[PDB]
Design a protein around this ligand. Structure first.
Ligand SMILES: [Mg+2]
Ligand SMILES: [Mg+2]
Ligand SMILES: [Mg+2]
Ligand SMILES: [Mg+2]
Ligand SMILES: [Mg+2]
Ligand SMILES: [Mg+2]
Ligand SMILES: [Mg+2]
Ligand SMILES: [Mg+2]
Ligand SMILES: [Mg+2]
Ligand SMILES: [Mg+2]
Ligand SMILES: [Mg+2]
Ligand SMILES: [Mg+2]
Ligand SMILES: [Mg+2]
Ligand SMILES: [Mg+2]
Ligand SMILES: [Mg+2]
Ligand SMILES: [Mg+2]
Ligand SMILES: [Mg+2]
Ligand SMILES: [Mg+2]
Ligand SMILES: [Mg+2]
Ligand SMILES: [Mg+2]
Ligand SMILES: [Mg+2]
Ligand SMILES: [Mg+2]
Ligand SMILES: [Mg+2]
Ligand SMILES: [Mg+2]
Ligand SMILES: [Mg+2]
Ligand SMILES: [Mg+2]
Ligand SMILES: [Mg+2]
Ligand SMILES: [Mg+2]
Ligand SMILES: [Mg+2]
Ligand SMILES: [Mg+2]
Ligand SMILES: [Mg+2]
Ligand SMILES: [Mg+2]
Ligand SMILES: [Mg+2]
Ligand SMILES: [Mg+2]
Ligand SMILES: [Mg+2]
Ligand SMILES: [Mg+2]
Ligand SMILES: [Mg+2]
Ligand SMILES: [Mg+2]
Ligand SMILES: [Mg+2]
Ligand SMILES: [Mg+2]
Ligand SMILES: [Mg+2]
Ligand SMILES: [Mg+2]
Ligand SMILES: [Mg+2]
Ligand SMILES: [Mg+2]
Ligand SMILES: [Mg+2]
Ligand SMILES: [Mg+2]
Ligand SMILES: [Mg+2]
Ligand SMILES: [Mg+2]
Ligand SMILES: [Mg+2]
Ligand SMILES: [Mg+2]
Ligand SMILES: [Mg+2]
Ligand SMILES: [Mg+2]
Ligand SMILES: [Mg+2]
Ligand SMILES: [Mg+2]
Ligand SMILES: [Mg+2]
Ligand SMILES: [Mg+2]
Ligand SMILES: [Mg+2]
Ligand SMILES: [Mg+2]
Ligand SMILES: [Mg+2]
Ligand SMILES: [Mg+2]
Ligand SMILES: [Mg+2]
Ligand SMILES: [Mg+2]
Ligand SMILES: [Mg+2]
Ligand SMILES: [Mg+2]
Ligand SMILES: [Mg+2]
Ligand SMILES: [Mg+2]
Ligand SMILES: [Mg+2]
Ligand SMILES: [Mg+2]
Ligand SMILES: [Mg+2]
Ligand SMILES: [Mg+2]
Ligand SMILES: [Mg+2]
Ligand SMILES: [Mg+2]
Ligand SMILES: [Mg+2]
Ligand SMILES: [Mg+2]
Ligand SMILES: [Mg+2]
Ligand SMILES: [Mg+2]
Ligand SMILES: [Mg+2]
Ligand SMILES: [Mg+2]
Ligand SMILES: [Mg+2]
Ligand SMILES: [Mg+2]
Ligand SMILES: [Mg+2]
Ligand SMILES: [Mg+2]
Ligand SMILES: [Mg+2]
Ligand SMILES: [Mg+2]
Ligand SMILES: [Mg+2]
Ligand SMILES: [Mg+2]
Ligand SMILES: [Mg+2]
Ligand SMILES: [Mg+2]
Ligand SMILES: [Mg+2]
Ligand SMILES: [Mg+2]
Ligand SMILES: [Mg+2]
Ligand SMILES: [Mg+2]
Ligand SMILES: [Mg+2]
Ligand SMILES: [Mg+2]
Ligand SMILES: [Mg+2]
Ligand SMILES: [Mg+2]
Ligand SMILES: [Mg+2]
Ligand SMILES: [Mg+2]
Ligand SMILES: [Mg+2]
Ligand SMILES: [Mg+2]
Ligand SMILES: [Mg+2]
Ligand SMILES: [Mg+2]
Ligand SMILES: [Mg+2]
Ligand SMILES: [Mg+2]
Ligand SMILES: [Mg+2]
Ligand SMILES: [Mg+2]
Ligand SMILES: [Mg+2]
Ligand SMILES: [Mg+2]
Ligand SMILES: [Mg+2]
Ligand SMILES: [Mg+2]
Ligand SMILES: [Mg+2]
Ligand SMILES: [Mg+2]
Ligand SMILES: [Mg+2]
Ligand SMILES: [Mg+2]
Ligand SMILES: [Mg+2]
Ligand SMILES: [Mg+2]
Ligand SMILES: [Mg+2]
Ligand SMILES: [Mg+2]
Ligand SMILES: [Mg+2]
Ligand SMILES: [Mg+2]
Ligand SMILES: [Mg+2]
Ligand SMILES: [Mg+2]
Ligand SMILES: [Mg+2]
Ligand SMILES: [Mg+2]
Ligand SMILES: [Mg+2]
Ligand SMILES: [Mg+2]
Ligand SMILES: [Mg+2]
Ligand SMILES: [Mg+2]
Ligand SMILES: [Mg+2]
Ligand SMILES: [Mg+2]
Ligand SMILES: [Mg+2]
Ligand SMILES: [Mg+2]
Ligand SMILES: [Mg+2]
Ligand SMILES: [Mg+2]
Ligand SMILES: [Mg+2]
Ligand SMILES: [Mg+2]
Ligand SMILES: [Mg+2]
Ligand SMILES: [Mg+2]
Ligand SMILES: [Mg+2]
Ligand SMILES: [Mg+2]
Ligand SMILES: [Mg+2]
Ligand SMILES: [Mg+2]
Ligand SMILES: [Mg+2]
Ligand SMILES: [Mg+2]
Ligand SMILES: [Mg+2]
Ligand SMILES: [Mg+2]
Ligand SMILES: [Mg+2]
Ligand SMILES: [Mg+2]
Ligand SMILES: [Mg+2]
Ligand SMILES: [Mg+2]
Ligand SMILES: [Mg+2]
Ligand SMILES: [Mg+2]
Ligand SMILES: [Mg+2]
Ligand SMILES: [Mg+2]
Ligand SMILES: [Mg+2]
Ligand SMILES: [Mg+2]
Ligand SMILES: [Mg+2]
Ligand SMILES: [Mg+2]
Ligand SMILES: [Mg+2]
Ligand SMILES: [Mg+2]
Ligand SMILES: [Mg+2]
Ligand SMILES: [Mg+2]
Ligand SMILES: [Mg+2]
Ligand SMILES: [Mg+2]
Ligand SMILES: [Mg+2]
Ligand SMILES: [Mg+2]
Ligand SMILES: [Mg+2]
Ligand SMILES: [Mg+2]
Ligand SMILES: [Mg+2]
Ligand SMILES: [Mg+2]
Ligand SMILES: [Mg+2]
Ligand SMILES: [Mg+2]
Ligand SMILES: [Mg+2]
Ligand SMILES: [Mg+2]
Ligand SMILES: [Mg+2]
Ligand SMILES: [Mg+2]
Ligand SMILES: [Mg+2]
Ligand SMILES: [Mg+2]
Ligand SMILES: [Mg+2]
Ligand SMILES: [Mg+2]
Ligand SMILES: [Mg+2]
Ligand SMILES: [Mg+2]
Ligand SMILES: [Mg+2]
Ligand SMILES: [Mg+2]
Ligand SMILES: [Mg+2]
Ligand SMILES: [Mg+2]
Ligand SMILES: [Mg+2]
Ligand SMILES: [Mg+2]
Ligand SMILES: [Mg+2]
Ligand SMILES: [Mg+2]
Ligand SMILES: [Mg+2]
Ligand SMILES: [Mg+2]
Ligand SMILES: [Mg+2]
Ligand SMILES: [Mg+2]
Ligand SMILES: [Mg+2]
Ligand SMILES: [Mg+2]
Ligand SMILES: [Mg+2]
Ligand SMILES: [Mg+2]
Ligand SMILES: [Mg+2]
Ligand SMILES: [Mg+2]
Ligand SMILES: [Mg+2]
Ligand SMILES: [Mg+2]
Ligand SMILES: [Mg+2]
Ligand SMILES: [Mg+2]
Ligand SMILES: [Mg+2]
Ligand SMILES: [Mg+2]
Ligand SMILES: [Mg+2]
Ligand SMILES: [Mg+2]
Ligand SMILES: [Mg+2]
Ligand SMILES: [Mg+2]
Ligand SMILES: [Mg+2]
Ligand SMILES: [Mg+2]
Ligand SMILES: [Mg+2]
Ligand SMILES: [Mg+2]
Ligand SMILES: [Mg+2]
Ligand SMILES: [Mg+2]
Ligand SMILES: [Mg+2]
Ligand SMILES: [Mg+2]
Ligand SMILES: [Mg+2]
Ligand SMILES: [Mg+2]
Ligand SMILES: [Mg+2]
Ligand SMILES: [Mg+2]
Ligand SMILES: [Mg+2]
Ligand SMILES: [Mg+2]
Ligand SMILES: [Mg+2]
Ligand SMILES: [Mg+2]
Ligand SMILES: [Mg+2]
Ligand SMILES: [Mg+2]
Ligand SMILES: [Mg+2]
Ligand SMILES: [Mg+2]
Ligand SMILES: [Mg+2]
Ligand SMILES: [Mg+2]
Ligand SMILES: [Mg+2]
Ligand SMILES: [Mg+2]
Ligand SMILES: [Mg+2]
Ligand SMILES: [Mg+2]
Ligand SMILES: [Mg+2]
Ligand SMILES: [Mg+2]
Ligand SMILES: [Mg+2]
Ligand SMILES: [Mg+2]
Ligand SMILES: [Mg+2]
Ligand SMILES: [Mg+2]
Ligand SMILES: [Mg+2]
Ligand SMILES: [Mg+2]
Ligand SMILES: [Mg+2]
Ligand SMILES: [Mg+2]
Ligand SMILES: [Mg+2]
Ligand SMILES: [Mg+2]
Ligand SMILES: [Mg+2]
Ligand SMILES: [Mg+2]
Ligand SMILES: [Mg+2]
Ligand SMILES: [Mg+2]
Ligand SMILES: [Mg+2]
Lengths: 49, 272
RNA sequence: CGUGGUUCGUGGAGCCAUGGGGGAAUCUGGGCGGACCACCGCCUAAGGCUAAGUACUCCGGGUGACCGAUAGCGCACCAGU
RNA sequence: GGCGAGCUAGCCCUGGCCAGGGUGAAGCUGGGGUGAGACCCAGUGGAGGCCCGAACCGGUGGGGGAUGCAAACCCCUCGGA
RNA sequence: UGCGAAUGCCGGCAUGAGUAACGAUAAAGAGGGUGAGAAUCCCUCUCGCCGUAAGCCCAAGGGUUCCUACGCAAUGGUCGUCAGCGUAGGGUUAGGCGGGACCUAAGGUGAAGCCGAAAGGCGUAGCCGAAGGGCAGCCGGUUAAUAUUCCGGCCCUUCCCGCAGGUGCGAUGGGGGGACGCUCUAGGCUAGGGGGACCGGAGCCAUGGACGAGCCCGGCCAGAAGCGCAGGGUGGGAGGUAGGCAAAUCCGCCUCCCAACAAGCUCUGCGUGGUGGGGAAGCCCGUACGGGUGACAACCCCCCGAAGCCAGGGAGCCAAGAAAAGCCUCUAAGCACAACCUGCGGGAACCCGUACCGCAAACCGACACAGGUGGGCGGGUGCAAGAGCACUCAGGCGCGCGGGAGAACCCUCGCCAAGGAACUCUGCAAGUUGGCCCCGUAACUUCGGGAGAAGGGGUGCUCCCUGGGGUGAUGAGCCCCGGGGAGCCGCAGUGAACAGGCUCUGGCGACUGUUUACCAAAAACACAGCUCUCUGCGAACUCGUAAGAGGAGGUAUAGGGAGCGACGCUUGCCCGGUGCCGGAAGGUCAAGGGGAGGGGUGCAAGCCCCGAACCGAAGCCCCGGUGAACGGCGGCCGUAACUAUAACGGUCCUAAGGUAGCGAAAUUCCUUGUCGGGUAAGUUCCGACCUGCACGAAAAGCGUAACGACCGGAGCGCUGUCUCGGCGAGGGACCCGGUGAAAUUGAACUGGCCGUGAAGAUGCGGCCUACCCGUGGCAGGACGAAAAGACCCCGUGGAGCUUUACUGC
RNA sequence: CACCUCGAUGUCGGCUCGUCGCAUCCUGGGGCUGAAGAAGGUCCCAAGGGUUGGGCUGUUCGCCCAUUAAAGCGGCACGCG
RNA sequence: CCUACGGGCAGGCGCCGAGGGUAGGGCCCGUGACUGGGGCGAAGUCGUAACAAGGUAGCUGUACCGGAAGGUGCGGCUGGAUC
RNA sequence: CGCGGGGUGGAGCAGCCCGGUAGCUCGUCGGGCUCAUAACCCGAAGGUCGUCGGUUCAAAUCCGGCCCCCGCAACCA
RNA sequence: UUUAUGCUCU
């Protein structure tokens, strides 16, 4: 039956994308946190062309 | 009149439709003077602020002329009477001698092909607009301005009208469709005649879907809710109100008056 | 008048601060010494700057009656993987 | 304090989809009818939260499954269409 | 700093156990090949399954999975020599396909501007934003793997420059256009398909017959201009002009005058078209596939025919159906040896994607998971039609453990003597019925319905006669609807498959519809419709600190709240309490005003405190009104010439004491009330009565045709439900080979009885019984497993909800 | 009453399958009778076997229909999920 | 089978057919818990509606209401007494 | 046998708190008006306060037991 | 402006 994950490359960037993260002060801290932790990826990796 | 149906389905048995014989070569509307695209939206910026709306037929907005002093003296011919989905009244497309076209809310009687005009001049017959002060006391009128130069606001609903009752200063005394006696400034434009399509009040939607077409989603009773939701929610097998009948937000809804007390407007009113 | 700060929770409640109303004076002027008054004293509000002594440890170093791979940092190992 | 409507609910914009058969509303035309009408009869017509029924949307009853094929499934049956 | 327990933590290894299982019952068999090894890889043949798919093409998503060589440790539920797996190499080619150097939509963002402690929230234009608008490529060939991308053929777009011709050119600005619904639809086409005695073609004559107008195979695709057929769009002049935020010669408006029609002018679709290209069966090779020939292949007539094209086609209808650019026209600044337009010529034309999977072993579900996933194509025959059903083309598959055996038991199926609901809470389940044509069809009814009511008859094949329609000719052929007559065969003719069991009578709900994703689909919600109430418009109301926004670009025939709930007949009395509404008086009432009068301190001027009368809002009090506002609508006693019963009376209380209509009911406790009906028998069912524990009128009352996967009662039909079982099939269970889990587990050398024990003993006492160990089975016990009881209580534990609890906002 | 069980001892009825007790429902054997016979009453012995099919209700139970030699009462965690 | 055989008879099939069966309608009669009124019946209960102006003139069609006769509204009739 | 309210002339009600005296309507009886009855008018009679005990100087009254009446409750199970 | 009523057969 229809599960929760329904991948959509635009949805993903539009939602957790880097630019989305930078618009909101709350998001900028996510990046602040993630960077401070040493995360290799500050943002969900996405593709398409 | 009003159209009826033989009961070849239930609902079709009680269903009743408007009579469209009064409607002159409508179908395609007048792309110029209207329409504009109409932003159909049921909530404000974000959230629902009027319950139970949405869906229903797409609509083009006919941008109608609610201020006629705009073209004083310039007469015009009534070209057609049209269907307007954005109001209960019908609209009348009129061609000005100017070559300018505008829609008006079609008054009762207003025949296709007759002349119309607005101004302090202006014969006191149907379709003509005049500053209130120049209208013979006792005549019925529609599409009145509430303050001069601010556009018509009163008596625009199908079948509605207002009567000029007397004069008092720079103000005249109207009896509004509500029955309220109000003073309006004499400079305010009105237009002689009642609105028309007065059979409007007598149609019967007939079915749930018919309400869906008009953009009205189902309305649910507080009685059917839970206490979380409404003053009337909860119980355990039906229930009287168990308190003064209230709205979802707590205020009483049977009698409790709501007009703001100390309101400048108060000084110009006198009825129900 | 309404509040905050002070140990002061309206208390005899001053002092410093100030959202609202009213609203001065320039040394014989003004503030304070815990309601108020007198006396005796202290200090000069409504402009501004000012090193050092102080706080911390991403970083480098030196030490340990500190751990010794289930410990010690989550990671002694290409782990914020 | 942030993260979530890529599940689900509602709404907004733009598209798409609904085999085949049945019933035969109004209106129209003609005829009868009358002072003129209402109206009646044919034919035409093709209305409907109309009927039967696939796709599609469902989830009624029963059986099976119960460390399952499956953290909601399978079969038969059934609702809308 | 010492561990045995914390359903402790981390790890390792055990038990169950060679046990369950190995993931759809579409299905397999043999020969040959490879190889250390083969049921599992390759090839051949036979068999089976999909075929509105289980075939093919797009979009998502995935991201090397693609092709090839060399490999089998692991991954593969077995095995693998194979693989979507390991190593390596290769593979994705565009001015025309998609997206971008185009347009705008919701929404997002946001110069101006507005608001907010900060963060930030709004917001006009503008900008961003697409599966919408716009825009130029069709047919073949080719690679192991890409192709509208490379190649071949034919055909187009834009940009730059240049000639020639032409014109007032010129825009982000004005105008036109783009430009739009749902249902039903016309004519003409196309895709697609069937047939052909005609055209082309390797071959074939079996097994009794056939050398035949035999069988088998194929009989097209693309194509500029021109042309032809069908169709879309469109009036042409002139005068006036004050409107289209400047200006227009354009558009709009008024008046004349000509066309009335596609006539013309255009733009599409289809046909034809120079030319180009494809081109079966079969046979021969070689696979791991494809290649040769068939060929110099043929390449044509008839018929059916779209939901697709001509397309902005037409008609009807109410719910009244995007935008912007491209484009055309108008003019403005400007410039007019510019510029723009037409034609020809030369040149210029960028970035991204392109492999492969894609109803699935490559996407979403931890899995090679019986689930989920949007658009297009989806052939033939038959069955009334159809995408339905059966069988089948192309194409694709037999589902990644097998071999046997023929027990119980389970699942999924088939049949059954006599009976026929006797089963059971219930006909649950299963049966019956079942498509089409015809005959026929009741109560009631809102006149539509109820109706597929009910109940019946027909249904195949053959020969003969025969009526209409389409296309062609007014014909033949090919299709398409039939009508009549005589016969034939079986148990049976919708011979297989897909196809309602029916009736009677209650309750609830009017109806279609909606809901507890995953135990409830309902008498619950919603619903048209009735009433009350608020709202005069910067409306009420809602969201927000605000700005702002929804309401609504609406205006009382409108909008908000509330209850009721189609429709029919109706909806009674009480305003004392609560709420709401009205009330310019009066009572009380806060800050404030006012200060009679008192006080502290000073030598004093004074400074500083209290403080009475009085004047001070809303609110409450008070006076009224109000029921489709919250709500409420009695008790005792007596009484008629048989008895009974009480129309009648007395008295006490109330704000008023329940009207109509209903009533042992979705309500009735006593209760299976009493009576009547149904049955041989009826706690239920139907009809009554009324003693209504405890109906009653918009939390509506009483009815109502139609409707319902709702709940109740009855009958007919028919049955494995049952008397009462039996036999049979297949998938499991069982045996053999391969792979191999799970909860659970203090340790065990783990028997019965009668006692005893913390009151239910394998473990204590007494007696009894009992050689050691398994396998298939049943479920009585191990107070069996599972979940630190959901009930209950306890905790000065928590949370949701309520109110005339308290206190606040 | 509150003794084992609340880190769980699943609760009525039906079905299935029983087994045991005897305070015996029938059948066998008896004594007494207000036992003529036949048929009963009442008590004693006796547990071997038997102890029907339906209507109603979830029912146990009970009422009822038709029968019968009889339509027995109990226990077994109100035996047995 | 008999023939006087292009024959008849027996025998076979077919139509219709008494009726039987199944299914659904129509009319009529009897009967039914209970229920509606009606008639009648020497001396029951409650009132007073009508006849005299009936002590509210009466009657009337309709509508609402009430233990009962009745009352009231609207309109109508005189078949109303009284100066 | 839980809680609450009751029991008073013939009927229905007061009086019970707080002590000391029993009141209202109806009915009953006598007399009147009337031809007569009712209505109406004038008079009068009638209760030991459910019951036994207790308290006080005194009990319908305050207290206790018993017998009846009405109302409410009987829930998780 | 207070009244209503009069058993059965002759
Ligand atoms: Mg779905
Ligand atoms: Mg997940
Ligand atoms: Mg996307
Ligand atoms: Mg989305
Ligand atoms: Mg890195
Ligand atoms: Mg917004
Ligand atoms: Mg937002
Ligand atoms: Mg209306
Ligand atoms: Mg509602
Ligand atoms: Mg609810
Ligand atoms: Mg909520
Ligand atoms: Mg609430
Ligand atoms: Mg409530
Ligand atoms: Mg209730
Ligand atoms: Mg202060
Ligand atoms: Mg403080
Ligand atoms: Mg304090
Ligand atoms: Mg203190
Ligand atoms: Mg202080
Ligand atoms: Mg001081
Ligand atoms: Mg201060
Ligand atoms: Mg201040
Ligand atoms: Mg000084
Ligand atoms: Mg000081
Ligand atoms: Mg001091
Ligand atoms: Mg002070
Ligand atoms: Mg100092
Ligand atoms: Mg300073
Ligand atoms: Mg400093
Ligand atoms: Mg350091
Ligand atoms: Mg060391
Ligand atoms: Mg280690
Ligand atoms: Mg470590
Ligand atoms: Mg070590
Ligand atoms: Mg560190
Ligand atoms: Mg670690
Ligand atoms: Mg590392
Ligand atoms: Mg928050
Ligand atoms: Mg969503
Ligand atoms: Mg489709
Ligand atoms: Mg006609
Ligand atoms: Mg005629
Ligand atoms: Mg037709
Ligand atoms: Mg017709
Ligand atoms: Mg339908
Ligand atoms: Mg239906
Ligand atoms: Mg259907
Ligand atoms: Mg189901
Ligand atoms: Mg369900
Ligand atoms: Mg079910
Ligand atoms: Mg099930
Ligand atoms: Mg099971
Ligand atoms: Mg220990
Ligand atoms: Mg341990
Ligand atoms: Mg085992
Ligand atoms: Mg086994
Ligand atoms: Mg097995
Ligand atoms: Mg299998
Ligand atoms: Mg071999
Ligand atoms: Mg070899
Ligand atoms: Mg094989
Ligand atoms: Mg082999
Ligand atoms: Mg296999
Ligand atoms: Mg992709
Ligand atoms: Mg790889
Ligand atoms: Mg491969
Ligand atoms: Mg391997
Ligand atoms: Mg291997
Ligand atoms: Mg393996
Ligand atoms: Mg596997
Ligand atoms: Mg090998
Ligand atoms: Mg590989
Ligand atoms: Mg190209
Ligand atoms: Mg493509
Ligand atoms: Mg492009
Ligand atoms: Mg460029
Ligand atoms: Mg844009
Ligand atoms: Mg913003
Ligand atoms: Mg901002
Ligand atoms: Mg762009
Ligand atoms: Mg696009
Ligand atoms: Mg497009
Ligand atoms: Mg393109
Ligand atoms: Mg082309
Ligand atoms: Mg390929
Ligand atoms: Mg190609
Ligand atoms: Mg090419
Ligand atoms: Mg231009
Ligand atoms: Mg269009
Ligand atoms: Mg057509
Ligand atoms: Mg073709
Ligand atoms: Mg030939
Ligand atoms: Mg032969
Ligand atoms: Mg030949
Ligand atoms: Mg052929
Ligand atoms: Mg052919
Ligand atoms: Mg073709
Ligand atoms: Mg061609
Ligand atoms: Mg013209
Ligand atoms: Mg001109
Ligand atoms: Mg202009
Ligand atoms: Mg062409
Ligand atoms: Mg052409
Ligand atoms: Mg050729
Ligand atoms: Mg070939
Ligand atoms: Mg269609
Ligand atoms: Mg079209
Ligand atoms: Mg059209
Ligand atoms: Mg633009
Ligand atoms: Mg020009
Ligand atoms: Mg110039
Ligand atoms: Mg060129
Ligand atoms: Mg080129
Ligand atoms: Mg490609
Ligand atoms: Mg695959
Ligand atoms: Mg593919
Ligand atoms: Mg699928
Ligand atoms: Mg698909
Ligand atoms: Mg595939
Ligand atoms: Mg598999
Ligand atoms: Mg799958
Ligand atoms: Mg998967
Ligand atoms: Mg499903
Ligand atoms: Mg699908
Ligand atoms: Mg087919
Ligand atoms: Mg066919
Ligand atoms: Mg056939
Ligand atoms: Mg068919
Ligand atoms: Mg198709
Ligand atoms: Mg199929
Ligand atoms: Mg095949
Ligand atoms: Mg398998
Ligand atoms: Mg057989
Ligand atoms: Mg049988
Ligand atoms: Mg039989
Ligand atoms: Mg039968
Ligand atoms: Mg039974
Ligand atoms: Mg039964
Ligand atoms: Mg049931
Ligand atoms: Mg039943
Ligand atoms: Mg069934
Ligand atoms: Mg018929
Ligand atoms: Mg019916
Ligand atoms: Mg009918
Ligand atoms: Mg039938
Ligand atoms: Mg039939
Ligand atoms: Mg038949
Ligand atoms: Mg046959
Ligand atoms: Mg013909
Ligand atoms: Mg044709
Ligand atoms: Mg023909
Ligand atoms: Mg069949
Ligand atoms: Mg069938
Ligand atoms: Mg059927
Ligand atoms: Mg319903
Ligand atoms: Mg109803
Ligand atoms: Mg439904
Ligand atoms: Mg649902
Ligand atoms: Mg559910
Ligand atoms: Mg749930
Ligand atoms: Mg269920
Ligand atoms: Mg349902
Ligand atoms: Mg908001
Ligand atoms: Mg607010
Ligand atoms: Mg505002
Ligand atoms: Mg607004
Ligand atoms: Mg608006
Ligand atoms: Mg309701
Ligand atoms: Mg009353
Ligand atoms: Mg009241
Ligand atoms: Mg009142
Ligand atoms: Mg009140
Ligand atoms: Mg008030
Ligand atoms: Mg006052
Ligand atoms: Mg004061
Ligand atoms: Mg003062
Ligand atoms: Mg003094
Ligand atoms: Mg006041
Ligand atoms: Mg008053
Ligand atoms: Mg009422
Ligand atoms: Mg009350
Ligand atoms: Mg009474
Ligand atoms: Mg009585
Ligand atoms: Mg009596
Ligand atoms: Mg009153
Ligand atoms: Mg009642
Ligand atoms: Mg009443
Ligand atoms: Mg009964
Ligand atoms: Mg009740
Ligand atoms: Mg009977
Ligand atoms: Mg009976
Ligand atoms: Mg029941
Ligand atoms: Mg009944
Ligand atoms: Mg009720
Ligand atoms: Mg009510
Ligand atoms: Mg109702
Ligand atoms: Mg009812
Ligand atoms: Mg249902
Ligand atoms: Mg059976
Ligand atoms: Mg078998
Ligand atoms: Mg094995
Ligand atoms: Mg004992
Ligand atoms: Mg024991
Ligand atoms: Mg021992
Ligand atoms: Mg011992
Ligand atoms: Mg022992
Ligand atoms: Mg011993
Ligand atoms: Mg053993
Ligand atoms: Mg065993
Ligand atoms: Mg066991
Ligand atoms: Mg078992
Ligand atoms: Mg516990
Ligand atoms: Mg507690
Ligand atoms: Mg607590
Ligand atoms: Mg205990
Ligand atoms: Mg104890
Ligand atoms: Mg335990
Ligand atoms: Mg357990
Ligand atoms: Mg005895
Ligand atoms: Mg015996
Ligand atoms: Mg004897
Ligand atoms: Mg004995
Ligand atoms: Mg039953
Ligand atoms: Mg019973
Ligand atoms: Mg029995
Ligand atoms: Mg017991
Ligand atoms: Mg038990
Ligand atoms: Mg169980
Ligand atoms: Mg049981
Ligand atoms: Mg016959
Ligand atoms: Mg007959
Ligand atoms: Mg009959
Ligand atoms: Mg009778
Ligand atoms: Mg008497
Ligand atoms: Mg009598
Ligand atoms: Mg009288
Ligand atoms: Mg009278
Ligand atoms: Mg009278
Ligand atoms: Mg009279
Ligand atoms: Mg009465
Ligand atoms: Mg009258
Ligand atoms: Mg009393
Ligand atoms: Mg008494
Ligand atoms: Mg008292
Ligand atoms: Mg008296
Ligand atoms: Mg007397
Ligand atoms: Mg006593
Ligand atoms: Mg005493
Ligand atoms: Mg409770
Ligand atoms: Mg009397
Ligand atoms: Mg008399
Ligand atoms: Mg009498
Ligand atoms: Mg007599």
């Amino acid at each position: 039956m229809k599960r929760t994950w329904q991948p959509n490359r635009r949805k993903r960037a539009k939602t957790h994308g880097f630019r989305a993260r930078m618009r909101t002060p709350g998001g900028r801290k996510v990046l602040k946190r993630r960077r401070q932790k040493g995360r290799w990826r500050l943002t969900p990796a996405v593709r398409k062309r | 009149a009003v159209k009826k149906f033989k009961p070849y389905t239930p609902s079709r048995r009680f269903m009743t439709v408007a009579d469209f014989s009064e409607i002159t070569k409508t179908e395609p509307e007048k792309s110029l003077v209207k329409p504009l695209k109409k932003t159909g939206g049921r909530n404000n910026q974000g959230r629902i602020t009027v319950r139970f709306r949405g869906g229903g037929h797409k609509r083009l907005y006919r941008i109608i002329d609610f201020k006629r002093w705009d073209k004083v003296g310039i007469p015009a011919k009534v070209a057609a009477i049209e269907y307007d989905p954005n109001r209960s009244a019908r609209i009348a497309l009129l061609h000005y001698v100017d070559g300018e076209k505008r829609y008006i809310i079609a008054p009762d009687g207003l025949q296709v092909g007759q002349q119309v005009v607005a101004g302090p001049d202006a014969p006191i017959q149907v379709g003509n607009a005049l500053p209130l002060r120049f209208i013979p006391v006792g005549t019925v009128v529609h599409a009145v301005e509430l303050e001069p130069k601010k556009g018509a606001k009163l008596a625009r609903a199908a079948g509605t009208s207002a009567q000029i009752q007397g004069r008092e200063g720079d103000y005249v005394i109207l009896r509004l469709p509500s029955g309220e006696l109000r003073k309006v400034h004499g400079e305010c434009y009105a237009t002689v005649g009642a609105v028309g399509n007065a059979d409007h009040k007598n149609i019967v939607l007939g079915k749930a879907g018919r309400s869906r077409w008009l953009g009205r989603r189902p309305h649910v009773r507080g009685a059917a809710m839970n206490p979380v939701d409404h003053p009337h929610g909860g119980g355990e097998g039906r229930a009287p109100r168990g308190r003064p009948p209230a709205s979802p937000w707590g205020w009483q809804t049977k009698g409790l008056k709501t007009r703001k007390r100390r309101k400048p407007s108060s000084r110009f009113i006198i009825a129900r």
